[model samples]
Target: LTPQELEAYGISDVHDIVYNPSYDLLYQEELDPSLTGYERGVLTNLGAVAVDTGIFTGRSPKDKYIVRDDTTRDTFWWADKGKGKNDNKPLSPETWQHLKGLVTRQLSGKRLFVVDAFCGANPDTRLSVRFITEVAWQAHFVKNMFIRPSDEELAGFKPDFIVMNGAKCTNPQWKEQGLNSENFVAFNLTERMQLIGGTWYGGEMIKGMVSMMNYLLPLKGIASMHCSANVGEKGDVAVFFGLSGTGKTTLSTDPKRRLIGDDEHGWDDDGVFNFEGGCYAKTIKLSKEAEPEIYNAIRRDALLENVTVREDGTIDFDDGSKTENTRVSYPIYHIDNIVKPVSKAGHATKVIFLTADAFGVLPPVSRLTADQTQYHFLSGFTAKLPTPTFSACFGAAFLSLHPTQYAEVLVKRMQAAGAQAYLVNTGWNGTGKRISIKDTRAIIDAILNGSLDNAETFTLPMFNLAIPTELPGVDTKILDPRNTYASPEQWQEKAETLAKLFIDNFDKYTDTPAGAALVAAGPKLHH
Candidate 1:
């Protein structure tokens, strides 16, 4: 690229640049002479080429710095350590530029890889983004993960935000560099640029953009969520919200419904749109029978990270020798029951929160009131990642705004669209037994197909969850956690223990405007 082009995004005197390359070219670029991973060839059986995430298999939250400048100083949500919530380290303009210089200097003679793509599925809300990487596989990863724009769209595309990822570069003078570590994923919102240095984790590039979306979408009245979604036979849409173990992927990729997107979506005024073009699934112990869609999607062009393949050429999903975070990134359409136009911006009629509660206190399935939902949406966060050079540069390390801001946005969207939130216990539920996925699907089927709307239901006293007395194909025996427990006393005691935890958690937000009602809407201490 021209020195002027590199300087355009604050990079200086860049020696080499690889302009946008086609997907096939990116795949062909992986041969050793061109770059790393030159020996991988047996990836087709699993539908992906295995790659190592050297230095970090996961995201580093502390090193990610958000530019605290004129535009962001007054508005960007600063880190709050008091509430045990904080992700961003405040960065200076000088430091950001210095890091840019570091990355560009690293790219002086080394070739770079470039790809152009959109971050959102809805044509109206999609963010046209240009990804500049030092590796071809990273380009291929984004090719499968981020929505691919039309040829015409790319002809004139200019990135709303740019992420220059120099995965192999680092700040050796980190101590003097005003950085937390040698690795840095510095993002500047006002300038619309992100830079990743050190660490070859592929997730850094996508997460960086996701963070920008998390900030920008909310300002536009769209809630950028970390969730999966689907559309039913009647065109009724539903979103499943949860972190890793909450069945967000499993439930949303239901064979009966047409998949919208697997992870990261936007709830806009028009409707819900997917923020990703593919699914990054946790493949530890993945079963073919249980998740045929994900299993089936593991094929050519998918990117598999830290997963093991046997000598016999079989993928042993049970192998955790690498890391339990083993994942496969595949195109969204690799699955069978996918919807075209990725998202028609379908406003959800029902929103499901899948939680894997190990305490067994929450009922198997329960309904959440508007206030309860708003609270849980913020509180339900188990872990969020930082915008890093390795992966998920802009993932929701935490809320960009206050917990209250998130709720205000959700309160408007759900009430406006008439969406009801259902808390599904996809978790371990405290007892030795696992919650039946069969039964969970049955309950979800009712919700999706509209059978649960008029079902005979009552307010479950302990959690204040409106639960149906019976479901069409579900046995009444597993419907309630108390039924699965050994004794009434054991059940009551554990349930009360769980109730106290939620109560204590709510105390932090007790002073919130809806504080009284929010607590009132939850389970009782004496129930």
Candidate 2:
């Protein structure tokens, strides 16, 4: 049936029909033959085969649909079959209700809106759309659609609130397409709303989206901090801050702890809550031996991107043909023992900063006092983008269009919260000698086991072992980044070399007013 014929049936356009054409004749006796014909034709066009008369069609064992509004001006075809049959299941009613309650409590008496603009329908994206739509529908809030909205449609929807999905690529176009500059700033939101996109290592777009959502929402208040989070069996909560590939997702979901949130979390007056429906981890080269849980999670039903397949039908994880930042997003309920009703409430405990340093001078882990926390927060030790070829930390090259402004805000929030901070070097520790993986794993073990948790307690005055003026974790004897521990003379020689590099970098910034002010107010002025 043509679009005109479908209009007569009050169906405007077939959004989607979940049917099996092979067994469609079995249900022919029940429904109108014309409607079935239309559904079959559309499904076939989208590579779907009707298996039976059920909500889900046999189109690649996934959800397939074509949605069209009244005018036919807004119409798109979407196929959500990334993972097989498992992706079709809906969120549990109880879990959905709990989430609704959390949103209502946090955003009560305030306008809530969503801005879904991407066209491709991945399973995680579909879940997010469904959940957001349900929340708006239940709360009686106005729902605005922006799925590839035209110039005319953009003018009509001046939303009080907006939730953007797949916003990274869209933002540039929105600017070029005449989306008012005022609209971008007026919405009281900042940061890209990309649900999936990250560095090649463990980075995935779903994690990116969760991180963005967590960061953007709380910006309206004093400042909400977003980071991967987990709570130990003892209820000791830890926030993991790292650029992409620092293992935030891997470490936070260690199975031994209760995960509050994986990729993104928000810190507020009450506490911190997650801003994601679920965790998205990069699964390239994923194996049961390396990451059993993560591997198992990516069953035939889980959403996957960028994974390669061989002629034998096995997957090749190393291939980046699909894109390095492969992504998968699912609800928190999908993970075992994940904290539910992800809301804006989590106490500030151990705030861990992760850096994957290729330089390798920093220790595996070091505790920081309040003053040190502020200094390091400003320092923001993660590596800068080396070149276009390398994947910068947290996809910093892509995410940081305005680095100075972004860094300033992040430091301010970390200071305001008075969060206990630590720097975990997920990089090398020496210049000439390569740090072995065993040593890295050992250091991480020491951190998780709590050996260095109270470094301040060990004071040896003779060796100048006392914690330094600014940060708590670094032993001043080893202040120089070039120093290694093989011998005292070797350590001193390297330390001085590394210290010079630090000083030089610090000097470059001193000309700036902010840097000048910080130096002027300092207790010890190196210059």
Candidate 3:
């Protein structure tokens, strides 16, 4: 990007803009006469660079803000998480403008990086994304994480939205500026621009854009989701919805399936199109034995941040000394079995909801009725913590409509496509550890193969989850969660505790036309 181009967008005082440099070029200039940051040990494993984020290893959602103005005045979801609290704080236009001014002008003579990319894999609805960053590796991170354009495509490309990330930039006057903290991510919907300053956590770079897409896509009658997708050998598509810690990545990136995308997708007339051309996988405790594709994909082109390293110059993925949210970003094609362009424009035959229920009361597998699916979808429920993180009404950070609106959309799509819905518990059963990955894969195998279609299933009494009496590959004894528990009363206590948790979260929704049945579908409370 040129200073003139940035000035056109009301950004000024910019110097030395490196416009869409090649990866080899960026790797070559990581530290040569570097402007601000100090450098350390580095090597090209295969073709990717290894770097460390000094202070932050993850995105701080608490610091993200959105401009409250006429265009977004009614469209934004404010205080949705609480009566008067949410991760998104609404800043006045003046505050956003000031933040933009500070972020754009802070770069003095430093060598800034610019990346021209696309956020959606399908050209039909892809947004041209122009990323201007203070960190070269962040440019590399985007280069790996987002869709890239061909020489012909980039010959004349423009952006629908822009993210100005000063991730490594500092602002000392933050206290006086009426900002929440030293770090900030402010979205201005009217101008279609976003600003990020302070902290080197790279996720802010993409999630900012994700928040933007969430608002925009819904207006066009598309469902933008925080989920993973993959296709079976026979071309059956499946979407996995889960929170950060759930096995969304691991389950979706199956070697038996052709990977559609790891995270962030859109369901439209052309089926599901991956919003990203790459995978930004959580690498904590990762190993080749468990995940050969993702495990082996960490090579020269991949970017790993804040991960622990051993004396052998290899990564110690098990060690979370740096952060529990350790990450690695690589192109989708890095995996052995991947669908290029990442667009599977066919209706998904299978829709799955995966939960890491630490309380271990949810059934190992359950077929959700339309009512139950809507109830669970709106609840967006997951029980992982001591109580469970009522994170999002729809379990996604960004939303333009009520959580019910999204649930309504899902219900229609599933009904129209004749899709089958399933809830798979990837968490503990209060047994030993959680079920084996082999079991996890086998359970999905039953779902995909349609074997569960005829299996004798019974509704577990307390939670009311439909439990398969028997699955071909899965053992009958461990099929129901009750069998996993040592005693009947203990299992009922565990089940009731989790059931009550859902009831509390169920109260926070707009009752739609189908809301009553959906509400009744949740676990019943007892006196």
Candidate 4:
């Protein structure tokens, strides 16, 4: 990295670095003996580079903080009343500057790898982002995840936001300064800057930019979604909204459709566009038979994080010994079936909300009204072992504004585009069998091809959901939640308990009359 390059990135007093290293150059640096001080990654048999993210195999939601100054004081959900208390912790402006200064100083003399890219595919709303990290593999990760600018675009790229990743640095004064912990991921949205310390999970950088967009886009009257999107051959677009483990990425990378994006996207008046240049897909127990698209995309230029790699360079996809959150980041083109230019799509004609409801109390497929859609959008419910989780907007961990802010925008867009919304349960029921992917796909196909339009339906009274009476090629008994239960009483108990959970979750949002209306549209409990 030359002085000119450093100056361009707003980096001062640094040298002995690689500025925007090409894919080949990054690979060389990854395994170079000279850089053994920090390089611990190895090339996999698939030609992908596998690296371990120690300690932080996943995001530390508590450690993520946003500056709570004039810009965010009124706009951001700062209390447990609106946003979940732990999700939107506040860092004072003074403390933010102190943390930023320390992280910047720690990275000043190191060999940095810089990536300058755009965060959105739409030229009108895109934000230029500069990623400065000290890892060769992470540079590759940034390049894989964000929209890569061409030489011409990079020539005049002026970053609207900057991310300084000090993965090797830690804060000793955390106790003295009353900070959350030694590891920190702090964002100063007012200044459009982010600082990371002591976390090697590359997703932090990906999510940091996404969270920023979640804030900025809504302010501009665009709906930002934590979902996967794809377009059919007929130009009909579908967006799948879900939390992790809900098959958001797997289902959207449809063999018959072109993928718009795998994780984050934006919807404006023009159409739906991707907020990322590539896909970050979970690879735990990945099978070629089940997910051929993502399985085959794991070749050269893909970056594997927290995956189990053997000495022979083969990968153990089932080994969650490291993390079940094992992930691979690759350019969008790797998926083969993607929208041309890999970005924008026509207005979504279908919106599907996915929930992995382990309790099996909810119907596998149900239709939603506009108010019910907003209600479910805010609930963002998903269940796993240990406890059930309901994060607002399916992304409470990354939201910048109130959930209603995004919910209102989404309802408006759906109405304007005449888009139909459906809730698809990809999880299991009390019988302990997970819904077969084949069956789930058939349900989705029916939804997309208009087979489900005005189909026979009956209401599941507890949740007030309209379940399809029959679906070709799907287990008719399993379509209705009550049929899968051993006894009507047992099903009613579980269903009512889950309904109560929804009611309790909505209690926090009842401060607004609009929110109250949506709550009235949610599940109704029966004695």
Candidate 5:
């Protein structure tokens, strides 16, 4: 409905809405009128932003705010200006200021960063409004912040970094206006964190931003690439790249290391800085023991998406039905000892690629040479989730038009950086003897103690690790997935059958121009 029509319904503007059972009221409050104008202008600018920046604009207003009742698919309008009653809870100015104070202090003495979470108004869409409110609340706490801008504000605030959240709802027409670029870091949640522009997750974009800002700002020359990163002792860096369930956030925030950035980060010639103002971890089936830091980070200040609440208002993270994808966002200071430097640092000592193999063939750990690294890098061999759904990789379903474009970019960057890369399988090694916690602990210990550092230095037959050839483990015949000696001849036969299945699937894409070129690159050999 038009703003005028909405106003006729006794609503000034829609800020947020909630189903409050205590008062039996569907409370809705008026949002700032300026917010609507800001959203409209940002949507229009997204096209230009994408083109000038090399970041793809992928959100649409239609996909923004939606509220659906499963029983009837009846959607409710919660926050459009002039549409609903301004009866929902209004965020008091004092509350808003207090929350902002907490955020600013938490981020104090740290390098300044900004996040542009452009959200459109759609009263019928609960998801969009909730997302915007949450981000808005978080952004208010940080310095150098930029909200969805009006045409006037757009000219004033040219953010060093831009993030496109809720891209599904973004208008595709923005592309026509030339709104896609390398500078733009597109935020997409497709079963996992997929890097849109570069090789490693949180690569180029992060680094590039910091590199550009070092001159005027106190921050270093680090650029923002699209990946998650954590810092180990003596400036050692560990990066996480995988679809959501592959444990990027879960593993990177190891108490043993200092977190550089989570979910999305930037790396440049100098060092790394996070793109996000806070952490946005998936809380589906979250365990307090497994993620105590993330567990405690959620509270009134932090926005919780789709999580279930008990009678006492406590969250039930174990129940998937309560929230299919539980998301929470809070500032980095929320976590202890998060690295917040503005000075430039050196190159990465090691690069780790994470993959969740549902097929259970890859070993718990493996090392790779530079050549083998490029091979698997191009193969992009992570397993697919169930059909009719997207499971990480390219974020949305495999884009037939851009399939492998992202991988190509990744190889280019890794080669340029001259970083030592390794593949660590977080999935199962076999069906009967899945790589369990015990085996994973052993592999992790090896990594921490530097024993696995030279695994790639050894030759095949003598290699001692017993995982699969295709999986993440040392290159030894002992771990060959198709080796008869490792398993029985019958099992070898079964392994060969699976191999053929993979070849067949791989064959379908080989006919394409891009696929043909990738094939010519040939298989990487183990030394």
Candidate 6:
């Protein structure tokens, strides 16, 4: 298609551009002549290309915004600065147009690469996304993450959304434009267009579509989630929910189970389906032994980002000198076992909410009541060393609707499907000792095999979680986090502190009826 014809898709007057090129073509073009300000990505010993995202090693949450128009004006949670901070910062229609005009103009007369793909695995609800960028490697990265359409499908493809990725352009007049920074990620729902500028990170393009799906799917009676999923031989589908550093990816890619998807999924009345065709795994200190599937999945087709390579051309995954957020993206078929042809699975039979609870207060495993599921799912609790963080629905950074909206759907699905929900702590115990992978795997096996169905359970103090009294292989002492601590008083102090944080954080949600019940389901300062 010529530049003049591209105006129908809102991309105007481009001198040279390539549309939907093959992987070999993209690779050759990327290597033959590198784009400006970019070092040609290195071909690694594994055949995967390794590259570094220059200034931004991760997503810029501050600069992310949604267009506040007649369509999306009342839909967003709408938070004031410093009061209740979230990622749904609002942009006006006028500003969106200004930014779009600026981005398209900047992209004019430059070499461009366009990619067409779908965001969802299911055909019924899948969204057609057209990515227009200035870099070929980033286009390859997009192709790896999203579902690629067949040649026949591409010929008649109509994009529901268009992404104008002007990664090399920045808003020099941002102060006058009322934007957060020179780097910007803005979405206009009405126009079905997303604009990216001033950053070359690949995740922006992936998440931009996910953020839009999180908005649209819920309105269509589908529960969109930021979680990992896999299916058992018995047709039982399991979903894992966790924030970054919480072991969601590590735990969900079970060898015996067929993976449904790694990161984003959607749950409808019938079953669950993947929103992405691949996995974006954190590769900081990634090892073959720890994650055989993910480690082996890195091959010629994979795209490495912000990872340090050694002089010998082999990757040094252990090196965090560049950043701890090192990542690799590859298609789901790169994995050994998955739902064939497509990545859809049956309705979830088990829901596992993972948290790296550094506080050492939460039990390594605990069962959740329906009310408890809503409570903890909304809490989205996970701890860093000496501190705690809560990402509502475990992905506050990408949610387009209110957190409660997702939580409500989660509760409804769990109740309807008779799905058991469990919280697993894949973290340490008061800096004493972290839970072992061997034991974690044993716990997962027991849960899936129905050994935990008739297990005896008792409510823990303060937090009020129903902890299993025993497991087949797990140590009895570690079953209760209080027993692992040095002193009862020490455990009580840490436990109470975390409980209070849960209480304080729920204050914002207490106004709603559902929030009131969920708050009641959480821990208590008093007995």
lDDT of each: 0.72, 0.37, 0.75, 0.85, 0.37, 0.84
Q: After superposing candidate 4, which stretches have Cα over 4 Å from the reference? A: 1-10, 79-83, 384-387, 428-436, 468-480, 483-491
Q: What is the lDDT of candidate 6?
A: 0.84
Candidate numbers, best TM-score first, in rank order: 6, 4, 3, 1, 5, 2
Tens digit per residue, CA lDDT, model 3, 338-392: 7755555577778888888788877778988887877777666665555586554
Question: Candidate 5 — what's its lDDT?
Answer: 0.37
Candidate 4's residue-wise lDDT over 1-527, tens digit each? Answer: 25565555345677577777798898887887665533588889998988888888999887888898888888877754452454777888888878887777777777788898989898888999988887888889999999999898878888899998888888888888777799999989888899999888889989999889988999989999888888988999999999878877767766789888877889998889999988888899999998888889999889888889998989999999968899999998997878877599879989999999988888888988889999999999998752578988887777887778899998888899989899999998778778888878888888888667678899888788888898887879888888888888888998888888989987777766668778779888995
State TM-scores per candidate.
0.88, 0.52, 0.89, 0.91, 0.53, 0.93
lDDT of 1 by residue, 1-527 (tens): 34466556545555566666675565566645634442243454664666777656777777888989897876676774334346777888888878888876775565666678899888778898887766777777788788887778877887888877777788988898667889988888887888888766667777777778888888888887777778877788888877666667667766668878776788887888888888787889989897777788787777777777777667778998867878888878787787885655578889887766776666677777787787676556322121101111122474565455566676689899888888787765546556788888887887777667667777755767778888788888777667777776777786687677666766665544655456766667662
lDDT tens digits, residues 1-527, model 2?
12342223122333322211212332231233443321221111111111111211111111111112231112111122221112111222333233223332333332222232321112122113211211111111111111222345344433222222111111223244332221111111121112110111122223223323333333334233446677666665667777666656665656666777654445545455554444555655666798766655554223333345455545556775655544432334546766544422346566777766554445555566544453444445554322111221232322211222333444455566544566666655555444454444454444555555554433212111223222333344333333465654554544344444444434433443545444332222123
Better of 3 and 4 by lDDT: 4
Q: What's the residue-level lDDT of 460 in candidate 1?
A: 59
Worst 10 residues of 5 by lDDT: 43-52
**TM-score leader:** 6
Cα lDDT for residue 323, model 5?
Answer: 31
Candidate 6's C-alpha runs over 4 A off are: 1-5, 81-83, 310-312, 429-431, 453-455, 485-493
| True-vs-predicted CA distance for residue 437, candidate 3, Å | 3.8
**Model 3, CA-based lDDT:** 0.75
